[PDB]
Write a protein that binds this DNA or RNA. Sequence first.
RNA 1: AAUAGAUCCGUAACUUCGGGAAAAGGAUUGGCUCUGAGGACAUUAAUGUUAACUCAGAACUGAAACGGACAAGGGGA
RNA 2: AACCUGGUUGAUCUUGCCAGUAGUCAUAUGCUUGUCUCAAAGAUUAAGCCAUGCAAGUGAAAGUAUAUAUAUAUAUAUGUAGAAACUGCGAACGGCUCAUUAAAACAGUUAUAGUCUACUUGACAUUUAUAAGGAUAACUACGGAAAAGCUGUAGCUAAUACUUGCAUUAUCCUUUUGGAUAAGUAUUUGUUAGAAGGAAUUAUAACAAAGAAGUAACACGUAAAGUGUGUAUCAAUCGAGUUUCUGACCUAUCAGCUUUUGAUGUUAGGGUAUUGGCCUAACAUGGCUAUGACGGGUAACGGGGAAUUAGAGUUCGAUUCCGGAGAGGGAGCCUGAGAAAUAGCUACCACAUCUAAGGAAGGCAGCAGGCGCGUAAAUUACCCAAUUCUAAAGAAGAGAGGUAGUGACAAGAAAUAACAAUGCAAGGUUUGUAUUGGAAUGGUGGGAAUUUAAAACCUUCCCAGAGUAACAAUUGGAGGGCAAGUCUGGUGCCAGCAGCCGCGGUAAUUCCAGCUCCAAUAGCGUAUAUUAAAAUUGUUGCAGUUAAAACGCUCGUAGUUGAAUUUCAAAGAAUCAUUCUUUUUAAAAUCCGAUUUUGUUACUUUGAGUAAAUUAGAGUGUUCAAAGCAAACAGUUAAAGCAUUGUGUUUGAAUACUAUAGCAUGGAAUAACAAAAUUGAACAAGCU
RNA 3: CCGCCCGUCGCUCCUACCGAUUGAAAGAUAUGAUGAAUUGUUUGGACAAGAAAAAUUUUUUCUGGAAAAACCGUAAAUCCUAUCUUUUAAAGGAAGGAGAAGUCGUAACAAGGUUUCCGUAGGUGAACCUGCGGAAGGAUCAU
RNA 4: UUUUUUUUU
Lengths: 185, 171, 257
Amino acid sequence: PKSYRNYSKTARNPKRPFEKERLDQELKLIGEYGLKNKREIWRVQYLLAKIRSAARYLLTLDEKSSKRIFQGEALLRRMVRQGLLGENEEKLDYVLGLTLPKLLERRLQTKVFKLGLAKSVHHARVLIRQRHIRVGKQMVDIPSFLVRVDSEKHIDFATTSPFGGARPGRVKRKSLKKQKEKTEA
Amino acid sequence: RDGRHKLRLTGGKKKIHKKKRKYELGRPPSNTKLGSRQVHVVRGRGRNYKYRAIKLDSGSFSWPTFGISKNTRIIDVVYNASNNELVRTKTLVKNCIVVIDSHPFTTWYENTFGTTIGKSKNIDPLLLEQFKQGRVLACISSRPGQCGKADGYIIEGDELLFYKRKMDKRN
Amino acid sequence: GKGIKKHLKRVNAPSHWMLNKMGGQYAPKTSSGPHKLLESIPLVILLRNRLKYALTFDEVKMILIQKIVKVDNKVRTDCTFPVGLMDVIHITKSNEYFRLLYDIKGRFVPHRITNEESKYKLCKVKKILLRKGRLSIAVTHDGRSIPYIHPDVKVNDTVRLDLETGKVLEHLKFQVGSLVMVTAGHSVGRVGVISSIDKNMGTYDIIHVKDSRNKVFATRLSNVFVIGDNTKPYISLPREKGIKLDIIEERRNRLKA
RNA sequence: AAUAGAUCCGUAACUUCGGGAAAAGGAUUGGCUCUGAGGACAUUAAUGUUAACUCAGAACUGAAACGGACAAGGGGA
RNA sequence: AACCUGGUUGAUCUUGCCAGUAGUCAUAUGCUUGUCUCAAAGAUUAAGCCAUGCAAGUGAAAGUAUAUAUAUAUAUAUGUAGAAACUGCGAACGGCUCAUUAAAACAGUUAUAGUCUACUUGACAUUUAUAAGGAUAACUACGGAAAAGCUGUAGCUAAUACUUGCAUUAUCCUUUUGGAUAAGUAUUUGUUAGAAGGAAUUAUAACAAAGAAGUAACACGUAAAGUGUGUAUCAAUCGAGUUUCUGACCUAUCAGCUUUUGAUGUUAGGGUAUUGGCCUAACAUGGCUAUGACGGGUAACGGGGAAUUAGAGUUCGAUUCCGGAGAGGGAGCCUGAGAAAUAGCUACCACAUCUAAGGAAGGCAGCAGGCGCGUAAAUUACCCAAUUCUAAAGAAGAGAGGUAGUGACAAGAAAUAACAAUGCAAGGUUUGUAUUGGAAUGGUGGGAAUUUAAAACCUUCCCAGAGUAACAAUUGGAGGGCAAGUCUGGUGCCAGCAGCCGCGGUAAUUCCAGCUCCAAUAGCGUAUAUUAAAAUUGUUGCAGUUAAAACGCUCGUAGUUGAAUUUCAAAGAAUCAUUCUUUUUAAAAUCCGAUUUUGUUACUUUGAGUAAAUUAGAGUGUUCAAAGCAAACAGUUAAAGCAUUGUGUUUGAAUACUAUAGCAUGGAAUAACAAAAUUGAACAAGCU
RNA sequence: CCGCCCGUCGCUCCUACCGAUUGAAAGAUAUGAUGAAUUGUUUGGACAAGAAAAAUUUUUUCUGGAAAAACCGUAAAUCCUAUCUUUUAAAGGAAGGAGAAGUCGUAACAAGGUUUCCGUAGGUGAACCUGCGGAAGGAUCAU
RNA sequence: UUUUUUUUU
């Protein structure tokens, strides 16, 4: 009877919501990352806190422990795939110390801005919402997409976008200019 | 019918739920008596017919000393290990005491060994006296309620002595 | 009434069946047959989710109606028929033989088998019984009652069974060199030669089994399957070869490609 | 008028703790066939002489009715 | 994220609670709502009542076919079918709900050597025959009443419905071969012997007595002999009933309960499928209890599971699955392997239908829907297409189930814009800031593809389709906790506001309005409950001189807690300077200089049985995510691999958890228990 | 200190307790009585089938058997008594608490003008007073 | 020796 499709939550309420230092730091973060509301900047800390708690649990295990190196190599493989830090940062202590901006930077709405395309982070966000981006052989328009290490090398404009070789310009404007030109001719 | 509606060993009463199920059953008893050999059948659970005897006259009776058995007919019941009202109302159980005709066993004895396998057992004077009288005491062992037939064995020895001592300091 | 349940919920299905959670709420309950429901699987999932031959119950049934599926060279038409732990199944017109073996993780997987090895099937006996005339008949794990067994055969010894004549060929004991297969243990899927036993006083007898990588693991006596002597496995093992490759060092093997 | 003798059971409020109390309220008691149990006198563990009315259960039976007459509390708030 | 803040005062430090704060898969409600995916939904209270419609039926080689239709060479033989009915199976599954329920159910752990077991599989069997007998439907003809899923006589026929009944095998002897000997399967009784388990009165064998039910008087047709249906016994399968041990909320203003009326056990017997006071007759007075019995309450079905969690913990669990219960309340029963069944019946209680007034028929806590209750809960829709069940098993069914409708229960993604120049501001020709003016995308209409049992939704492509992108986002505050106003007008202890402290008599920063800002956002308030906060329930981890709290004092049972003491150390290889690894050092039985066991329990280390869902987590780009358990690989059309022309390959659904209790297991330390002298030993010799 | 404050008595409102009423109601247990339905057994006893005779009928015998009745047994349901649990009526009584201010008195806080307080007992319109034996939380850490 | 009292913010 009841649906078996499991569902969960992503954003956790920060609690004591009227602390000025935290509110201003969140304002700094959302301004520097060109976001739209506080739900994303409440979800992201849950994202980088889940694996931080995993690292906490992993650390207390002693060395040469079968579970310890198992989960450590798994989490480090995910770390290197998601590209949070470079090869030099390899240890569990190294991957424990992560901050909000480094986790944020792997979002598409700023990856496309870093690559160029748009002259603003908000311009990039509205473009990707208007689905003018191509991740490579795959169609993506969600700004919260987490680009891995290997997905960066083939980011380009959307093939079906007007700037990607599709329809050049406004249909109404083109028809109007062509009809006025033929009427004059 | 069984296994509930009874207070625990501590003395507290288990209040009743889980109303009675069919597999418990608990069929009413039967009182097999002397008379015409007619019985009924009762369909047990899982299609297991039971031969329910309510009136028995003849069955099998075994001489245990000789390890033999002959078909004969019971005359009467004289004692039961249960309440005396049963032996008064002429019922048969699997530990009742009944009287068996001595003629078939005497004829078998005369045919085999003679005189009035593992033979030459010297019998006993008390059973010889009972044989000359013509009726002997024997105890039914089979369950008439279940198998529907009254099978028994000839009781001899110190147990026979105890039975007669309790039957007849005595009236 | 409280009679026998004629349904099986999808979530209640055994783990090795591997049923999708969203594909309804009912699992095909295996009919009564030669093996238990837990340690056997039905032809439905065997040919739909494992062989991928069919995609629906109706098409599974219309494959089944034809006498092209044979177990022990016997045509079967029971849709939910318990195949069992170890058996020989055959498809005729395409001429393939599948022997149902284990997997190191502990699932059920058919294994390609030639006609010669298919003719050679093994059954672990459960108990022997004496009948009228002082004759002994032994019952295998396949619900198969084979009479007139060798006197040297013991209760835990396994017996070579021929498919056509239904006769015993040779017995294999429980010796220290007896290669066995854990059937329902926590260490299911690993083949081993056994290292020792411990005869406990009227409880579940345990045996410590030695692996090829010198791994010793204890499992009950009630759930072992003698598959040959120390010479070689009499049964063609699957690709994993019965060696429980460890979980930590499985990922290094998985990652190179 | 209603039971009322007797045995078995059971007995409230209240109380001055003594009572209330035969509280209230019940079953039985007919019959015969029965059965059993409970003192004084003698013998080198037991066997003989000789005096009770109190209980209990199986019967069936009698016109399903019985302290068979006489004799005898009506209770409760 | 192992967290605090306002309030007792003229001011201070405490205790202390109140209030604030955040979460809830936890309910209801107010305001608002452009999108998509996902989907709880009459449990709370009334396990109350139900109109209505449906929810269990079933025939593809194979039971019975002159209702009947059709085709082959010609009334001859085959056929294909087939309404009704007889027969067989199922209907005891499933679905709903949680009233009852307190060592009961449930959960883990055992046994059934104390039992039953449909279908299926595997073995297999004993005391007129060129094929036996009746007994009946549908149907024919007359009806009854208002009717039932109502019904009589006459006649008939079949079957796999019912009932009778037709070889032969084994053993002993001279010793391939001839004689003689005997014929009961289950089940019961009496007397014996006796491949396994752990223990048999086990399997089994021998004798003496009984002894059912069968071993086919039935139907279709596969090798270039077969099948269906039915049958005796055994084993497993699908299960079930009993059953060992361990575990439960509050309450002593529940201290003694049970025992004629079985309570505790013995014997004997009935009954059951089997054990058993389950019951009966006799016998004995026993059984439980401050370690909380017996009672009482629960707005208590139990479980894995949920929330909150640094760890401890606290609260919830009707509800996706397991186990138990019920079908208005009890009780009884047939059938059937399986029911004390209830969309089966019987009787009472309480409701309630038709009625010609005689009599019939009923249980929506099944699916929709209505009434009653209530803060509160959907459509009297479509489909067996997906999963699965039933059957006489492909084509037929299934209010199971799926799909769709309502649905700000919740949950996930994500619109309400972005861009270049002047004007201004800041700054050495860089950022923001009212104008122009164009690109780009959705929302929307339609058309199509795909999709679906059909339809709808999503996605894909093409046309109209944004400048105040009029294609417009609100909720609650702006004294403190706690951000935003002594900004402006109206009212003036009245109105009101205010979770707490407090504001309101004219300058109201707290009311009523506007502008602005503030917090969140298609979401935000309100009420109740619960969790953390709470180290204000404190085992970790509280307090008791004065805030709450040492009994007036002492004795003392249960409980709790209890001095020390019995086997040391030395020697050797390996990382950095240390650390780490290995052997023995008394006595007693074992092996002809050496071969090796020497308390119990608690405790402690390892294992096997550890259902799934859920939990953390693997791997896996549903546009990410909520997901789910996939998918990936070269392939405008061929190469490899292998097969002696073709055949795709690799894979994933692992891991830890599943009490604390049970099983096995190493154990030196710490705890207990015993042996330890009013005597008890061991050795040697002789005696029985 | 022109501080604070206490009680009796006043008025309004709210909450709970007692309450005669053989209180009632509802249920749930135990006792006794009645007892529908019904298992099994027994007695039956419409015929439906057999066996004999005469050449359409009859006597007798054997099963199976429908109505109906009796007996234990399961036991619905109703009533008596007792007990337990849960609500409510109830004339009235006696309290407590909250209200913005009311009257009388001066009780405590200073040696509060009589130091305060405890237990107990008695008296008083009230706070209060008094006796006995205690404490300093005293106004005394002190010949 | 006697000395009672002092609305409401």
